[PDB]
Amino acid sequence: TDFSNLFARDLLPAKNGEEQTVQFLLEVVDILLNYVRKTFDRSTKVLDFHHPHQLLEGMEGFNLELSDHPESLEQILVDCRDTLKYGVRTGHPRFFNQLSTGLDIIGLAGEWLTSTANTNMFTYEIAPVFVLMEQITLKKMREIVGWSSKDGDGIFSPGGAISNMYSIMAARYKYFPEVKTKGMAAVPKLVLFTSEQSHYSIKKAGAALGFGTDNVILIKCNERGKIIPADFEAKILEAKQKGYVPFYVNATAGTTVYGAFDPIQEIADICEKYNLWLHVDAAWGGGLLMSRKHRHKLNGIERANSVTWNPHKMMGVLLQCSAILVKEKGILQGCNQMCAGYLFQPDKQYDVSYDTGDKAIQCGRHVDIFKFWLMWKAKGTVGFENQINKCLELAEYLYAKIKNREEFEMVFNGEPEHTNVCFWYIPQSLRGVPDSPQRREKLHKVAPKIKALMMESGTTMVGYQPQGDKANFFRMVISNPAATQSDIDFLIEEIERLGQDLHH
Amino acid sequence: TDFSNLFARDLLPAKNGEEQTVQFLLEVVDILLNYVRKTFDRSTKVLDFHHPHQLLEGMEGFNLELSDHPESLEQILVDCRDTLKYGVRTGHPRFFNQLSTGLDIIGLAGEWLTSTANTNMFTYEIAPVFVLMEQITLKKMREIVGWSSKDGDGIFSPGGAISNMYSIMAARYKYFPEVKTKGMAAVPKLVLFTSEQSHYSIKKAGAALGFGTDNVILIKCNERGKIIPADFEAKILEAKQKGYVPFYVNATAGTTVYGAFDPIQEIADICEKYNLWLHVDAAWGGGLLMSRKHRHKLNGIERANSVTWNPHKMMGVLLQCSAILVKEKGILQGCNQMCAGYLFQPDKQYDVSYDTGDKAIQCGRHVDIFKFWLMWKAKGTVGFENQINKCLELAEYLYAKIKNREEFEMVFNGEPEHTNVCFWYIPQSLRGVPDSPQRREKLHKVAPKIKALMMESGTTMVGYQPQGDKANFFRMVISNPAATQSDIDFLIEEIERLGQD
């Protein structure tokens, strides 16, 4: 009869709704604090798995349907509790399913404040502090990349896929600025280059931006999943022999599956020779720039024309936090500006070059900076460094543990460059067969079955995927500071235990 | 002591940091609660304005610079307090600067939960509840638009600008699917049509997607800022006469400045006749679909092939909340899919049609659904309706108040269709008049001066802008349920006060 007789219409801005608003929000916070507590407790399941149809039918009875009339605030609080009950705990020490794992407390605080501030990034006028924080943070990132203060630009975007899109748009504007007014049909045939094992967002941007996927050329990778530079130069020559114009390459920089690093320095030499825009996709591998021990894997990045870097991956900033960094200033502005009305707006009393909105592809833009800035203040560069180092350390631990075991087979020959560890579990019946197309078809079914059993028990989660002619394999990854040695020991033992229950 | 010698490294996941984690977060919440309290208090300033260099060149105990070593949690709490101190209160009853104004308490709660859940929208695997909420909500939105309850399509996007971009991509794939593989050079000179007063995101997507801005054709508007269908038809004929290929029109649907509504039904007739994709940009005007009294302004929308609708504007959902709705299912999937790795994954144990990420242009995608879904549960459709109705009511009040005053001049002849009220403050010197390029040069300087004085005093904020040949004018807008009639009285009196100063 308290919250069960109260409605949202009775809260602020409703006259003198202050105390009840405070009490409601404190009741919400209480629910979230309990969830935060349980996230770091290993007795808690990673997830209570339900098929889509189970939750759609009233489970139980959590009602997802919408209606004409309001529910009570008590029912709203119940809906909050149930939503968290049936979701996946992405902060759990034993959640290894994605590249982004864990729950940073400072990041969480930063997020809660950002939501309270509730503003757009497009002008200094309504986001003065956040605009300056972005400027400070972006330049710091460019310094870490190895670029000089002489030049530099950048913006945060809604995901690294869109950061990658930015780089291609910027590269096309630098070389063929007439595309903006006249379109793709008014310039020569432009061709892009990316690794066979690079992220699909390159092809996606290729299609979206009017290049066509036929004109996104995949470069051959060696055994370790790295671009072979000789193939890159050969593809360039092949393109211009038929009258096409090579203008852009994407180097990764920490691939999504292998965690491989493309040889940036060799690629840069070829780019300098043929005048190609060099983009480095460090969405995943960019975290390693924070480590003195590991940053050498990105050597040559200082020669890139642009860099994609996702703090929301390795640095464990909360979703989303993705930057595109561009060496030369003015390219993003020139490429994207429409000088509308109305929003920018040259006769403001302040320097309108702080209205960053017109160099974006977005109009309205969510504030992603505060959570990241605050975390950097709370940790220091050394904080990120130590965190990244231990993640990579326990990835080495994992690799060494399974490296020479009969139960496991490594997908490729080579030490992992990132926290990615790619392996098959080999069931007893398959050990020493040997390798055959019939063996691969049976092996293919092993990973999805084990994953199904993982999700049913809710003990752990890890991703599986095929690649090229390889059958489904586990891609283990570590980015969660909550993950410990015993959590890795647990996972290994769990996969083995579940590999002995393939008969359901 | 307390937090003076505690650090982030001592909090969870650190072994014994549970008690200090809870206490820290409760101290953060306390700061946010005080800010929420003050947001709805009219004694509080909307903003304490500072030039960028003023904030950069040191504020007391507040360093923006980053360093190698951590600050104490006490200093972190101070940084939070200072950040909010020097920002703009977008929830303030007297904040009228943008189309998105106000602070919804349920929306705020929803946001806090979403951040705690911290997940991606791309698969049912890691976002089971949120994926279903999105499916339920999108179909409800399609029903409100007037489309079928079965099938249909849509997705939430990071802004209405990108929702607009989706619609052009979808139309292009529907009409010219060869572009995806061959590029734009395989189908020379495709053109897009949009109003002269439509949102710049159409031109922006035109440039980005390879059409060229030359091939984004602007349609003439009448006195009231509406597309002249006449005109629309004439430009189509002109375009195909020179060999170009029309395929797409954008109708708005609630324009950013005038708040005008394009005549969708007449445009739809022309689209049906010439086989053009009809997109309705209801980013701003879409909130009016929730009102039985006002939804008629969007009559014909049921005939659209796609609709952009931003709950984060009129419905007052916290940024960002934007949907693209597509009548025909499978277009977004066909247009956008890359069928990678990873993730998708076709051989999962659950129905993989519930993995929706491959029809997006994004890979990773922020959960924008919960805050919106929760607000809808908390308010009901009737809740949104009553809220929308009062905002439009006090926009009528404003219009009537200044309509026949010597101090004010209306930018165009006609009653506002939305909450947008466009007017000049005319100082004594320019009464009256006559209209000339010489006079417009003087009037242009008025609005920016008053705005500068507004921001200095921090009493209120309202936008100003030019359009075509018109000098800078004020564009008042109302979307904040906290705004009252007395706040409208205050703003008007404040404009007049600042007007001769």
Side-chain angles (χ1 to χ4, degrees), chain A residues 2-14 17-18 20-37 39-42 44-59 61-240 242-405 407-414 416-435 437 439-440 443-455 457-492 494-500 502-503, chain B residues 2-3 5-14 16-18 20-37 39-44 46-59 61-241 243-271 273-318 320-405 407-414 416-432 434-437 439 442-455 457-500:
Chain A
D2 190 31
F3 281 119
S4 54
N5 287 121
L6 286 173
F7 295 83
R9 61 200 168 192
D10 303 316
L11 308 176
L12 286 173
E18 192 173 299
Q20 306 195 303
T21 299
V22 167
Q23 284 310 123
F24 171 75
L25 289 174
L26 283 171
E27 289 295 331
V28 175
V29 169
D30 217 295
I31 297 164
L32 309 175
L33 260 29
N34 180 240
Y35 183 89
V36 170
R37 289 175 186 268
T39 284
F40 300 92
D41 188 1
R42 283 166 185 81
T44 314
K45 279 165 73 180
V46 178
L47 76 167
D48 188 16
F49 177 66
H50 302 272
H51 289 267
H53 62 83
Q54 297 184 234
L55 300 172
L56 244 26
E57 284 161 5
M59 170 68 200
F62 185 29
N63 182 40
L64 298 177
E65 303 299 312
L66 305 161
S67 61
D68 293 337
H69 301 279
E71 288 185 337
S72 74
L73 294 173
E74 178 57 35
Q75 194 55 53
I76 290 300
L77 290 164
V78 167
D79 291 337
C80 289
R81 191 228 293 150
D82 285 346
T83 295
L84 291 166
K85 183 178 184 285
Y86 295 113
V88 182
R89 290 179 181 267
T90 58
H92 201 284
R94 288 162 185 186
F95 181 78
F96 305 110
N97 206 64
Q98 314 293 145
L99 265 41
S100 311
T101 63
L103 186 61
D104 193 280
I105 303 304
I106 306 301
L108 183 66
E111 282 282 42
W112 289 356
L113 186 144
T114 305
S115 297
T116 310
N118 190 217
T119 192
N120 270 294
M121 283 300 298
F122 53 33
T123 62
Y124 178 86
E125 192 174 308
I126 82 315
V129 181
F130 302 135
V131 166
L132 297 180
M133 283 174 176
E134 188 161 288
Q135 175 186 120
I136 296 302
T137 309
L138 289 168
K139 81 159 288 198
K140 182 78 163 185
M141 293 169 85
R142 294 194 295 269
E143 288 168 349
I144 292 155
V145 165
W147 295 342
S148 77
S149 301
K150 172 157 78 281
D151 219 332
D153 202 9
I155 193 170
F156 282 89
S157 59
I162 294 181
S163 297
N164 286 168
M165 195 181 77
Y166 270 110
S167 75
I168 300 166
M169 284 179 63
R172 179 178 62 187
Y173 187 75
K174 157 106 275 186
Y175 288 112
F176 300 91
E178 63 267 34
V179 180
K180 193 178 172 178
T181 53
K182 292 177 172 70
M184 283 293 287
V187 301
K189 206 178 210 71
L190 274 23
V191 305
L192 312 75
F193 300 88
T194 194
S195 173
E196 280 173 348
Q197 295 181 219
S198 68
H199 193 261
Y200 69 92
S201 58
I202 307 298
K203 280 270 183 179
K204 213 140 172 154
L209 303 170
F211 291 90
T213 55
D214 292 349
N215 300 306
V216 180
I217 305 293
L218 309 182
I219 305 158
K220 289 196 189 75
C221 288
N222 64 17
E223 179 66 24
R224 296 170 63 203
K226 297 172 170 284
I227 269 173
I228 306 167
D231 188 64
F232 170 45
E233 183 172 357
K235 294 280 172 56
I236 296 174
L237 260 44
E238 204 184 322
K240 44 203 283 160
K242 56 217 299 167
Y244 309 162
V245 180
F247 81 103
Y248 175 101
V249 68
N250 167 61
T252 329
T255 56
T256 304
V257 179
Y258 279 18
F261 287 81
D262 287 340
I264 304 171
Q265 203 87 235
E266 290 181 74
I267 291 158
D269 285 350
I270 300 169
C271 287
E272 194 187 35
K273 186 181 173 187
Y274 294 98
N275 193 19
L276 266 68
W277 180 287
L278 168 56
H279 172 74
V280 171
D281 188 352
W284 175 227
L288 271 66
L289 291 165
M290 306 300 285
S291 163
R292 272 135 50 199
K293 167 188 247 281
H294 291 278
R295 71 161 291 127
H296 67 93
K297 287 161 184 176
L298 296 94
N299 276 358
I301 193 168
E302 76 278 353
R303 293 210 271 161
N305 299 103
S306 64
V307 177
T308 284
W309 183 350
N310 288 9
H312 76 71
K313 294 198 183 198
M314 263 310 265
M315 295 187 278
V317 181
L318 277 63
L319 233 134
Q320 280 178 313
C321 190
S322 178
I324 176 73
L325 310 176
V326 184
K327 175 128 84 185
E328 186 184 325
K329 191 170 161 61
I331 298 174
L332 291 174
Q333 184 72 41
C335 179
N336 289 313
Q337 73 190 156
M338 285 295 150
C339 311
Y342 132 84
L343 203 60
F344 351 79
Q345 254 176 339
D347 53 8
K348 298 192 187 194
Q349 9 81 98
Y350 68 87
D351 187 9
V352 297
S353 77
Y354 287 91
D355 297 345
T356 288
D358 220 5
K359 70 211 258 193
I361 181 61
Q362 288 177 107
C363 180
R365 180 165 66 99
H366 186 79
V367 183
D368 293 332
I369 189 59
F370 184 74
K371 62 179 160 192
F372 177 31
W373 179 90
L374 199 66
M375 279 173 63
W376 207 325
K377 296 291 272 182
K379 292 176 160 179
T381 304
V382 172
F384 286 119
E385 180 179 45
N386 290 155
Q387 177 176 312
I388 302 305
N389 285 166
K390 75 91 202 159
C391 287
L392 283 151
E393 200 179 357
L394 63 99
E396 291 167 46
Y397 173 85
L398 202 201
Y399 176 65
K401 265 289 211 76
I402 61 164
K403 199 172 79 73
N404 302 120
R405 289 189 66 171
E407 303 91 326
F408 304 102
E409 189 176 323
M410 301 317 292
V411 174
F412 67 98
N413 190 18
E417 302 185 80
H418 212 303
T419 68
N420 314 53
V421 181
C422 299
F423 63 93
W424 290 287
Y425 171 85
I426 315 296
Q428 185 69 250
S429 61
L430 292 176
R431 295 168 201 181
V433 161
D435 200 10
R439 144 139 170 151
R440 288 194 173 103
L443 182 62
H444 194 71
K445 290 156 84 82
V446 174
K449 171 95 261 193
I450 295 175
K451 177 57 173 288
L453 299 167
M454 274 177 181
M455 289 179 72
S457 59
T459 52
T460 185
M461 276 178 84
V462 59
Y464 72 89
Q465 73 293 104
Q467 199 190 259
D469 66 353
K470 313 257 194 287
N472 289 133
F473 55 87
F474 295 104
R475 177 220 61 186
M476 186 66 173
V477 272
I478 303 140
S479 68
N480 189 186
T484 65
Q485 177 186 348
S486 66
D487 293 306
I488 298 313
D489 288 333
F490 177 82
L491 179 104
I492 299 312
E494 186 77 356
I495 295 180
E496 208 165 331
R497 184 183 76 84
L498 266 27
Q500 301 171 178
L502 300 164
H503 62 103
Chain B
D2 203 34
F3 288 108
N5 206 238
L6 283 174
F7 294 83
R9 62 199 168 195
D10 301 319
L11 307 177
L12 287 174
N16 302 299
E18 188 181 313
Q20 290 149 335
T21 301
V22 168
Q23 284 312 121
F24 171 74
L25 289 173
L26 283 172
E27 289 293 331
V28 174
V29 167
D30 217 296
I31 297 165
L32 309 176
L33 260 28
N34 178 241
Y35 183 88
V36 169
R37 289 176 187 267
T39 283
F40 300 91
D41 188 359
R42 282 164 185 84
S43 58
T44 314
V46 178
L47 83 162
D48 186 28
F49 180 70
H50 299 288
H51 284 269
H53 64 82
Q54 298 179 214
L55 286 176
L56 283 167
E57 284 155 41
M59 278 304 179
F62 187 47
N63 175 39
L64 294 168
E65 300 295 308
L66 305 160
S67 60
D68 294 336
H69 300 279
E71 288 183 339
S72 73
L73 294 173
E74 179 54 38
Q75 195 53 53
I76 291 301
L77 291 167
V78 168
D79 291 339
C80 288
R81 287 188 201 98
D82 285 344
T83 295
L84 291 164
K85 183 177 185 284
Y86 295 112
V88 180
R89 289 177 181 268
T90 58
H92 201 283
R94 288 161 188 185
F95 181 79
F96 306 109
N97 205 66
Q98 313 293 144
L99 266 40
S100 313
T101 64
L103 185 62
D104 193 278
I105 302 305
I106 306 301
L108 183 65
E111 282 282 41
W112 290 356
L113 187 143
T114 305
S115 297
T116 312
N118 190 220
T119 191
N120 270 295
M121 281 301 297
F122 52 35
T123 61
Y124 178 86
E125 191 175 308
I126 82 314
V129 179
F130 302 133
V131 166
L132 297 181
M133 283 174 175
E134 187 160 289
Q135 176 186 120
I136 297 301
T137 308
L138 287 170
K139 82 158 287 197
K140 181 78 162 184
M141 292 171 86
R142 294 192 293 271
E143 289 167 347
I144 292 155
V145 164
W147 297 342
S148 167
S149 286
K150 64 179 186 190
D151 307 318
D153 212 353
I155 191 158
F156 283 84
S157 93
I162 290 171
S163 292
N164 282 171
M165 188 184 71
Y166 268 111
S167 80
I168 302 166
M169 288 177 68
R172 185 171 62 182
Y173 189 77
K174 165 97 269 193
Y175 280 84
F176 301 95
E178 60 267 31
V179 168
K180 187 176 181 178
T181 49
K182 285 171 167 56
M184 283 293 285
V187 295
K189 250 59 175 155
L190 265 37
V191 306
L192 312 74
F193 293 101
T194 196
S195 174
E196 281 173 345
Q197 295 183 218
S198 69
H199 193 263
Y200 70 93
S201 59
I202 306 300
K203 280 271 182 177
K204 214 139 174 156
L209 306 168
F211 291 89
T213 58
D214 292 351
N215 300 309
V216 180
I217 307 294
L218 307 184
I219 305 157
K220 288 197 191 74
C221 291
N222 65 17
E223 180 67 23
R224 296 170 63 203
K226 296 173 172 283
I227 270 174
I228 304 165
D231 217 69
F232 173 36
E233 184 161 15
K235 294 265 170 60
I236 296 170
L237 267 22
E238 190 186 312
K240 61 216 306 261
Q241 197 270 335
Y244 304 163
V245 181
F247 76 111
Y248 175 103
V249 70
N250 169 59
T252 329
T255 56
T256 306
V257 181
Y258 279 18
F261 287 81
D262 287 340
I264 303 174
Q265 203 89 234
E266 291 182 73
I267 292 158
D269 283 354
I270 298 169
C271 286
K273 185 181 174 189
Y274 294 98
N275 193 21
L276 267 66
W277 180 287
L278 168 57
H279 172 73
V280 173
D281 187 355
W284 175 226
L288 271 66
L289 291 165
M290 304 301 285
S291 166
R292 272 135 49 198
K293 167 188 248 280
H294 290 278
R295 72 159 292 127
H296 68 94
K297 286 160 187 178
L298 299 94
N299 276 356
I301 193 166
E302 74 278 351
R303 291 211 270 160
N305 300 104
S306 66
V307 177
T308 286
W309 183 351
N310 289 9
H312 76 72
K313 295 197 181 197
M314 263 308 265
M315 295 187 277
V317 183
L318 278 63
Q320 282 177 307
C321 193
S322 178
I324 177 72
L325 310 174
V326 185
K327 177 130 82 185
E328 186 184 326
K329 192 170 161 60
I331 298 175
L332 290 173
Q333 183 72 41
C335 177
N336 288 313
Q337 73 189 155
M338 285 294 151
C339 316
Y342 113 84
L343 72 178
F344 28 95
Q345 303 139 13
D347 57 357
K348 298 188 190 193
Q349 13 81 71
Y350 66 88
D351 186 353
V352 294
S353 72
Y354 288 92
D355 290 350
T356 295
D358 219 7
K359 70 211 257 193
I361 181 61
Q362 286 177 109
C363 179
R365 177 167 67 100
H366 186 81
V367 181
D368 293 330
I369 188 61
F370 184 75
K371 61 181 161 190
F372 178 30
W373 179 91
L374 199 66
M375 280 174 63
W376 207 325
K377 297 291 271 181
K379 291 177 160 179
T381 305
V382 171
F384 286 118
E385 179 181 46
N386 290 154
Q387 178 177 311
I388 302 306
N389 286 166
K390 49 95 176 294
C391 289
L392 284 151
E393 201 179 355
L394 62 101
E396 291 168 44
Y397 173 85
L398 201 202
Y399 177 64
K401 265 290 212 75
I402 62 165
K403 199 172 80 72
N404 302 121
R405 288 190 67 171
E407 304 90 326
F408 304 101
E409 190 176 320
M410 303 315 297
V411 174
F412 66 99
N413 189 19
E417 302 185 82
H418 212 303
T419 65
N420 312 55
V421 180
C422 301
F423 62 94
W424 289 287
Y425 171 86
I426 314 284
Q428 187 69 248
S429 326
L430 291 167
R431 305 168 200 178
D435 188 27
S436 59
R439 137 142 179 153
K442 273 92 88 67
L443 184 53
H444 201 62
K445 308 181 75 66
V446 181
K449 171 95 262 192
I450 298 173
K451 177 58 172 287
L453 300 166
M454 275 176 179
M455 289 179 70
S457 60
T459 51
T460 186
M461 275 177 86
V462 59
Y464 72 86
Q465 71 291 108
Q467 199 183 248
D469 73 315
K470 312 264 202 293
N472 290 144
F473 52 89
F474 291 108
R475 177 220 61 185
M476 185 68 169
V477 272
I478 303 141
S479 67
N480 190 185
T484 67
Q485 176 167 317
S486 61
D487 297 311
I488 298 303
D489 293 350
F490 177 87
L491 177 107
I492 288 315
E493 285 157 24
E494 191 81 344
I495 288 178
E496 143 84 325
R497 189 179 75 83
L498 274 47
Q500 343 100 149

